[PDB]
Swiss-Prot record, chains A, B, C:
Belongs to the IMPDH/GMPR family. GuaB1 subfamily. Residues 95-152, 153-211 form the CBS domain. This is GMP reductase. Its cofactor is a monovalent cation. Activity is allosterically regulated by the ATP/GTP ratio in a pH-dependent manner. At pH 7.8, GTP has only a minor positive effect and ATP only a minor negative effect on the activity, however, at lower pH values, the effects of ATP and GTP increase. ATP-dependent inhibition can be restored by increasing GTP concentration. IMP and XMP are competitive inhibitors. One of its GO terms (molecular function) is GMP reductase activity. The active site is at residue 302. Its EC number is 1.7.1.7.
Amino acid sequence: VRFLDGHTPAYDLTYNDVFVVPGRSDVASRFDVDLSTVDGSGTTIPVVVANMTAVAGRRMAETVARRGGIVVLPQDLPITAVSETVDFVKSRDLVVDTPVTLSPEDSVSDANALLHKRAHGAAVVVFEGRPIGLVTEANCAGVDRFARVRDIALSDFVTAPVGTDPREVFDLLEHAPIDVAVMTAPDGTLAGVLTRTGAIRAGIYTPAVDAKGRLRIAAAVGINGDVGAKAQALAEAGADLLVIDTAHGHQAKMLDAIKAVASLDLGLPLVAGNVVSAEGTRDLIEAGASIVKVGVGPGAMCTTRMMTGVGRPQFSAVVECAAAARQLGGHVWADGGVRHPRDVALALAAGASNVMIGSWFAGTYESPGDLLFDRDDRPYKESYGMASKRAVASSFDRARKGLFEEGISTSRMSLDPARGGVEDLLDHITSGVRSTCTYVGAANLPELHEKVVLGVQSAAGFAEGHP
Amino acid sequence: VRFLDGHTPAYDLTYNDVFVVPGRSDVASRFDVDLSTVDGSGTTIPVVVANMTAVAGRRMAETVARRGGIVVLPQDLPITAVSETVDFVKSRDLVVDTPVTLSPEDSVSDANALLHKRAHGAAVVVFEGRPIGLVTEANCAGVDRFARVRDIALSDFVTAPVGTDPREVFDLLEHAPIDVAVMTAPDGTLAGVLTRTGAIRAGIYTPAVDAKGRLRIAAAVGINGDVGAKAQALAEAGADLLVIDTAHGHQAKMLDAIKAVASLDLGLPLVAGNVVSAEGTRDLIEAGASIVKVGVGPGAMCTTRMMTGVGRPQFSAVVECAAAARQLGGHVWADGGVRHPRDVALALAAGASNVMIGSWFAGTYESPGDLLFDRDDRPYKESYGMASKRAVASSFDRARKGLFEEGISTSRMSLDPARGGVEDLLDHITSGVRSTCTYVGAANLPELHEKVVLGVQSAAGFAEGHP
Amino acid sequence: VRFLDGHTPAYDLTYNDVFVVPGRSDVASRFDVDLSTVDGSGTTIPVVVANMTAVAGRRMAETVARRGGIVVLPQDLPITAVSETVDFVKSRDLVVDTPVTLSPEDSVSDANALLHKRAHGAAVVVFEGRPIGLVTEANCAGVDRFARVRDIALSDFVTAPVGTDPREVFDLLEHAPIDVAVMTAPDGTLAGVLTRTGAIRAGIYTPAVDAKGRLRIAAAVGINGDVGAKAQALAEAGADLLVIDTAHGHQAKMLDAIKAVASLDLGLPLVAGNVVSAEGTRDLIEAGASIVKVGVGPGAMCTTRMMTGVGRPQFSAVVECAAAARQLGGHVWADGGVRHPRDVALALAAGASNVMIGSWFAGTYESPGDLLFDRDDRPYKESYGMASKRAVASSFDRARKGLFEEGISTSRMSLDPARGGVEDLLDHITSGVRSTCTYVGAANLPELHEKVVLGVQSAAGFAEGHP
Ligand SMILES: Nc1nc2c(ncn2[C@@H]2O[C@H](COP(=O)(O)O)[C@@H](O)[C@H]2O)c(=O)[nH]1
Ligand SMILES: Nc1nc2c(ncn2[C@@H]2O[C@H](COP(=O)(O)O)[C@@H](O)[C@H]2O)c(=O)[nH]1
Ligand SMILES: Nc1nc2c(ncn2[C@@H]2O[C@H](COP(=O)(O)O)[C@@H](O)[C@H]2O)c(=O)[nH]1
Ligand SMILES: Nc1nc2c(ncn2[C@@H]2O[C@H](COP(=O)(O)O)[C@@H](O)[C@H]2O)c(=O)[nH]1
Ligand SMILES: Nc1nc2c(ncn2[C@@H]2O[C@H](COP(=O)(O)O)[C@@H](O)[C@H]2O)c(=O)[nH]1
Ligand SMILES: Nc1nc2c(ncn2[C@@H]2O[C@H](COP(=O)(O)O)[C@@H](O)[C@H]2O)c(=O)[nH]1
């Protein structure tokens, strides 16, 4: 990638150590740039939710797929749950979000705990398939925790049929006391709930769909055990994309797994990682992988940097691997070390065909975890590492292996008190990437890579601007 | 610009990463150097107040214009208010500051809130155009908040006619209980209020005036909409200098706006920004701009560095753009990243024809904002970013554009408990620049640029000295 | 008064040391008892606002007079202000409260400070005598403190003509976003503002009015100086009731003042105090006083107990003086030591024809003081003692008298965060007195005195019940 004159630092650079120099721009507005990825994963935004059990669930899968990004299901997961999640996601409206359906016999405690499963802020009490009420934080508060939800003073909702343009439902919700509105099927059954900002987003983002027009989804497999059988069963389960993940993506087991999956000829794009070296990417590409995950160590839950000293600063690894893959025709997914939208913008600028968010999305409403509360009542969630799920594998043998195994690290990802949903994190990331495109003057991601110029900055250079 | 031998860092440098090496000096004192700018903006000190609605007002405009610096009025402002502000500023005494005029029927609360509008520390109660009393924090305290100001125990004031030299009013205020003194017109009407330190400053600073001897003022326009009509109407409104500001100053819209304004042949100097590249400055100069604003990202209210990764360390961008502009004959205004007078001194040293302060001046008495108080009772003010006012542009369209728009960032700029007025910040900045001139040994700003030698310093190098 | 068998304590009892034993009751509800006073002061509730400059103002006067209680104007007040206040009060609607009238040219700071003058929670912006807008804490917040009130985003109000029954305006305000409603004169000019709870209270309370149907008001004079001339001028000023107040109501100066006022034959009822002895009440009654204030020392602002050791527990003094006055046909006002409605109920039970609240009402919205805020942002107000205004009287003489004079004590009366208005304190007091009537079984205040039975309780007896 192009660098400023005289910029040959004697160290690998991270995201905080680099910056983008704006160039001559012809892109008028942020909406004039398209974020469609070229990697073949079919994501209209360069965002992938990581294959972490704390960040990858059915709700996040459907939400991000509707917003145009693919979601990788966590590895080492019972294929029954995988099939259930895939069937759930593929049966979702391309525009309307699936609400928190509440049976009239549910308790107040269950309703209150479920209200935070989604970012809508309200839950639908539905009887016999017909929506009969709405609950929120207001009517639920004060009443007894174990009273039935049929006696929670159900509020009135704005009902509209499925197929009305986002304009009409938007103006319908201009003065609505409750932001959400129930999209009902023509027969009268509830089909979903659409929000004011959801109506806004329905036009900006184009949902990522497969050849059959269903929300794309992905799943991950390890290398321990029969990789071929697991990958084949995953492909038959309906997963659009297969991701083979391990702590070290340059070992012979990784190459054998990629070779087996490629020989299976499943037709789905191939994703392997992680390698932070050009030779590792070359080996993975020659092994039969179309997409290469890059980054071992920058992950916010990754510990190997402190325990082993291995790793690489994310930006330099991403740019070198992207150069290698583009030399061999392959494509690159940056993984780990993403905490600000500048990280996404720089990862795409370095040459990566896509970026993968990880534990940042764990601090969202839709992450498959428990929304706990701290002492100061600030919302947050616990993010865990994959640990043995990303590692190559009687009571004695189990405990002996577990003694030397890296512990499951835990972190507290705080929720935004106002913009807590993953919708708003995606909005921030996409706005940052669009602004980067406008500053560079690129109409698309390949043009972003081609026309970006990057400079090096010191520690004090990062202090410039408002945090 | 000249650098120390062996100093070729592989990264763009910010203000904290550079230092000035003193050379052989013939300038005896700080008062022996003149800070007159060469850019044609006619500012006798190298200080410009930014085109921010939280830092650019009529009071700051008149104060800084009297002290020798130009003020850029915020963009996207009703031309009626622009004309009112320009007429107010052009009708100000070149020596005497306009006080807080208080009608006798004003309440105690209004008087107390108005007392902090200016740095004088006292407000003038004037009846029928004749000054009849003075109020301050002492007599106002304790009395009922809604009692009339005619019953606030008005104090006695030192009255002097307009035209007395600062020497005489200075010695008149040597033992005065109230620091301020009322300069009255020959007919007896109140013309202004002059302070002890104001008398001191009346000789050190030479006010910036136009060809008609009136306090210079500037105004800003965006690129969205008809730039030519807005610029022409601004020129007819009486603005001395036109500033065309946008988030990205290298886009085609910027060039078209500069071309239109230059074709208008208004005669005022042309200011465009922001570009942090030599090619951007070349394009702006060829587009018909005499002065180029440089710096996108270092701004204390700017967020694009964290959201998009775009930007550049301020010092390297300023020096490169200054070199380019001086190659093409243009002149440079550094913008953003100014928090200490060393930043101003380094910006002028890098080659910029002027520096623009920004949110630092928002924490002053004269900034067009509300002087709020924190829990610890330390005075402070809220500084906001321009956001869409610096960005290129039905309810649906409005909300859709606002969803992706960067939020209006807010910061708390604390007031100096003693030297809170913008007069004292200007004193600090000018003292720092004069000391830099003496250390370099330069009699003027062009000599500052010519004879300055700059070295590179590490993180621990910045720790040297008293903070 | 009747006491329980065997209750002959060897100490004077205060309110905390006594309790009422309920008897056989025929009063069904609290609304079945009338609180009309027999003293001739014409107050329909047994509440009098004290002659304290921190608790007695025009707003409190009109409010309490509309609610059925008389207000004594503070002594040592310029008769011009007395006449202005009396004319203001006598020109008030018997049902509608006078709102915070706001001229369109007032500032935001003035509007915000004025909003807390009344308990309505909203202020009326009126132009040319016609109401044009409403302001509250919501629209006022966030906007600049010195912006004009014509640009404070005036809200819509419910307008009704004067004369509509409280039922109609009550149902009109059932779903109103703003609790208050503007009662307008038939010509369209604004006549007042009536609230939802104000509509509720318009039927429960019967306003205290004179023979001409105007809100009754009272004023106070001291004993120093010509008492006769001051009392006569006060009577001509329109004051319905005259109160002669001093620290010691048994001195010869008190008797001479009462004799002079009685010889004036002004026709208004006579109020003198304070005496806590039967002989003092006898002397005051024989001096030509119809009503006797009792209580010197129990006052929450009174200091003489700690400085001099003089005083008396309020309950025993009140009962003894009431017995003496009823023996001579006079009537009694308890003064001081009122902090809970039980104090009012016990004062009326002891035999006092009325009770006088004092500094408790100083912590209200309508008290003539400044609503200050503490560090924890809890609303409160400063209550001051009368000091020399209740004491018998060159720079040397002034300072010599002031050296030995008791200092003006200050106390912090906290505002109720929800029920801060004096309307709600009056509601609490009246509810307590009505409940006491029901528990005793009395249909009126004379029956309360006749049929009440009081017992003595120890320190631990006061701990019973919820505080
Ligand atoms: N009643 C009800 N429970 C729900 C709904 N959505 C999620 N849940 C709860 O959440 C569980 C799954 O959590 P998830 O893996 O989706 O975060 C379900 O088994 C169920 O207990 C809903 O719409 N209604
Ligand atoms: N070595 C290691 N890497 C992990 C673990 N958990 C997650 N990761 C890596 O870190 C990524 C997420 O980090 P993030 O992008 O949130 O900073 C995952 O996609 C995966 O590549 C773990 O327990 N160990
Ligand atoms: N009465 C009075 N108000 C003033 C004076 N200077 C500023 N103000 C207030 O401040 C407002 C403008 O604030 P600025 O934009 O000057 O910071 C005016 O509309 C007025 O309310 C003055 O001398 N007298
Ligand atoms: N991108 C961006 N730049 C801003 C915004 N507000 C101010 N700026 C820039 O930052 C400068 C002030 O920053 P300062 O000099 O106070 O650090 C302004 O003159 C302008 O160039 C904003 O909202 N967004
Ligand atoms: N503009 C305005 N000021 C009021 C109003 N009511 C009270 N005030 C203010 O309050 C002062 C008197 O306070 P008070 O003695 O009534 O508590 C008045 O002189 C005036 O400053 C009102 O309706 N409008
Ligand atoms: N001795 C004395 N009594 C006072 C003073 N201020 C108020 N009082 C008395 O205390 C009463 C109010 O007390 P409260 O009823 O609020 O406890 C007044 O009506 C008056 O009788 C003062 O400064 N000194």
